[PDB]
Paper text:
Lipin/Pah phosphatidic acid phosphatases (PAPs) are Mg2+-dependent enzymes that catalyze the dephosphorylation of phosphatidic acid (PA) to produce diacylglycerol. pmcLipin/Pah phosphatidic acid phosphatases (PAPs) are magnesium-dependent enzymes that are evolutionarily conserved from yeast to humans. They catalyze the penultimate step of triacylglycerol synthesis, through the conversion of phosphatidic acid (PA) to diacylglycerol (DAG). Structurally, all lipin/Pah PAPs contain highly conserved N-Lip and C-Lip regions that combine to form two domains: an immunoglobulin-like (Ig-like) domain and a HAD-like catalytic domain. The remainder of the C-Lip adopts a Rossmann-fold, forming the haloacid dehalogenase-like (HAD-like) domain and harbors a conserved catalytic motif DxDxT, where the first Asp coordinates a Mg2+ ion that increases its nucleophilicity, and the second Asp participates in acid/base catalysis.
Structures 2, 3, and 4 were determined using a Δhelix construct with a D148N point mutant that modified the DxDxT motif to be DxNxT. Mutating polar residues in the active site to nonpolar equivalent residues has been demonstrated to stabilize HAD phosphatases, enhancing structure resolution. The Δhelix D148N point mutant was crystallized in an apo state, Mg2+-bound, and Mg2+ tungstate-bound states by crystal soaking. The Δhelix D148N structures were crystallized without any cofactors and then soaked with either magnesium, or magnesium and tungstate to generate three structures with active sites in distinct states. Comparison of the apo and magnesium bound structure saw replacement of a water molecule with a hexa-coordinated magnesium ion in the active site, characteristic of a HAD phosphatase. The sixth and final magnesium coordination site was occupied by the carboxylic acid group from the sidechain of Asp155 and was located distal to the catalytic Asp146 on the opposite side of the magnesium ion. In the apo structure, Asp155 was observed in a similar conformation but coordinated the water molecule in place of the magnesium. To determine structures of additional catalytic states, we soaked Δhelix D148N apo crystals with magnesium and a variety of substrates and transition state analogs.
Author numbering: 20 to 46, 57 to 155, 161 to 228, 242 to 321
The structure:
């Protein structure tokens, strides 16, 4: 079974509160350290099946099992903008101290995200693996240049949770002509953590305030990817769908292209943010 933490996304609101996506962690009290500092007065508990949660009282004074911590708890993390190291430490009287490590990202309310499917969109095709999946040409250079203009790449996986750590290793090992894949969270479809892609992106959209549109563009390889992005606030002009021949359709302009050509027009399609 899985041991680790799905990448966590936290967003600072314009009133300075914090909202986050659900914490999915798997290995009794659980303590937290962020950027190698122990966080005081924060703890999680664990269900029999191994999933962990934040205990929170409801108005009837019953303990509710929350995956989304309150803003006050999140403020105690002292998160920095961007990537942060997070470790969860489960203490058991029978099995001792157990530690898992993951990634927690802090964005601002005006941060702009660019979504990328992994399988079929990064890999060329959509249980026995060695990490040698072929990668579409030129995708690392393009995504690098998107990130350099101020956007944040967010990766999406629909593979089972057993493959999550493998997917992270696969993306961080890609090297194309010296270019690498920009670091960013890998979100996991909630069906794999026991219409799902569209529910996930709407969840992500909703940790940002309603008066901004945080998801700027999306890269996919199926028509269902396009629908998921549209209903999460991406304009059709900014949805890119690639096929197994590495031909990219820019849906809005009904244009055919490629990662290489999109990269040529990077300042047109992904203009630099201030």
């Amino acid at each position: 079974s899985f041991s680790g933490v799905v990448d966590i996304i936290v967003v600072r609101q314009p009133d300075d509160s914090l909202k986050s996506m659900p914490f999915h962690i798997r290995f009794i009290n659980i303590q937290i350290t962020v950027n190698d500092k122990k966080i005081e007065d924060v703890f999680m508990l664990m269900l029999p099946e191994g999933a962990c949660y934040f205990p929170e009282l409801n108005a009837k004074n019953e303990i509710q099992k929350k995956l989304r911590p309150s803003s006050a708890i999140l403020k105690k993390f002292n998160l920095k903008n961007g990537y942060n190291k997070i470790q969860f430490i489960a203490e058991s009287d029978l099995q001792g101290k157990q530690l898992i490590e993951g990634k927690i990202y802090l964005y601002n309310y005006d941060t702009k995200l660019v979504i990328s499917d992994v399988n079929g969109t990064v890999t060329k095709s959509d249980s026995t693996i060695i990490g040698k999946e072929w990668t579409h040409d030129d995708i690392a250079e393009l995504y690098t240049n998107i990130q350099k203009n101020g956007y944040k790449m967010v990766y999406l996986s629909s593979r089972p949770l057993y493959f999550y750590n493998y997917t992270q290793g696969y993306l961080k090992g890609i090297i194309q002509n010296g270019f690498t894949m920009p670091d960013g969270p890998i979100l996991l479809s909630p069906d794999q953590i026991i219409e799902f892609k569209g529910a996930l992106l709407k969840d992500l959209r909703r940790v940002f305030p309603e008066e901004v549109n945080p998801i700027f563009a999306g890269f996919g390889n199926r028509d269902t990817d396009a629908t998921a992005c549209l209903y999460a606030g991406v304009i059709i002009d900014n949805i890119f769908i690639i096929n197994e021949q590495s031909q990219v359709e820019i849906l809005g302009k009904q244009e055919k292209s490629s990662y290489k050509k999109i990269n040529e027009k990077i300042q047109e399609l992904f203009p630099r943010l201030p």
